[PDB]
């Protein structure tokens, strides 16, 4: 539904990071570059955020508003 | 109130649409006030979604 | 067919661009039709895609 705060496995600061990543993909920058240049070392946080679904703009599209 | 006639991204169509923790605002209780100075009690990230 | 034909056939239904032929933004988008993605009048998308 929406980007999870903290990381499954270590627990890093993940949902911050969310938005800019779609930046980096509203840019010229690829996957792996991104996630290199935000700051994400170890696979896990690479798992996290190019694994996501972001379901929550779905949802509010039959949201009553 | 005011935003162009297409208005295709929720940016310019809605506002605080998205709850970002710094719409977090510490409440002092007591004398909380006094011990903390201003700026010190707050989320770390400021940016978390 | 006559090339004359056609050259007024697309001429009609589409654009130049780089030598190339684009089909105009009308035609992909009728005046009832809207975006899929966000329901946006199709106007807008003939001006964007213009
Ligand atoms: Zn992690």
Redesign the interface.
């Known amino acids: 539904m929406i980007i999870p705060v903290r990381c499954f496995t270590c627990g890093k600061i993940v949902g911050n990071k969310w938005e800019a990543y779609l930046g980096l993909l509203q840019a010229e920058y690829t996957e792996g570059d991104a996630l290199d240049a935000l700051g994400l070392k170890r696979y896990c946080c690479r798992r996290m955020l190019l694994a996501h679904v972001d379901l929550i703009e779905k949802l509010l599209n039959y949201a009553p508003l | 109130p005011h935003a162009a006639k297409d208005s295709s991204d929720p940016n310019e169509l809605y506002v605080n649409h998205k709850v970002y923790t710094r719409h977090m605002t510490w409440i002092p209780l007591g004398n909380q006030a006094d011990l903390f100075p201003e700026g010190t009690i707050r989320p770390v990230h400021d940016d978390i979604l | 067919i006559d090339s004359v034909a056609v050259l007024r056939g697309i001429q009609k239904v589409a654009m130049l661009v780089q030598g190339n032929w684009v089909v105009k933004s009308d035609i992909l988008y009728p005046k009832d039709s809207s975006?899929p993605h966000?329901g946006?009048?199709a106007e807008?998308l003939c001006r964007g895609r213009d």
Do not use: A, I, Y
Request: net charge neutral.
């Open positions: 975006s966000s946006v009048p807008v």
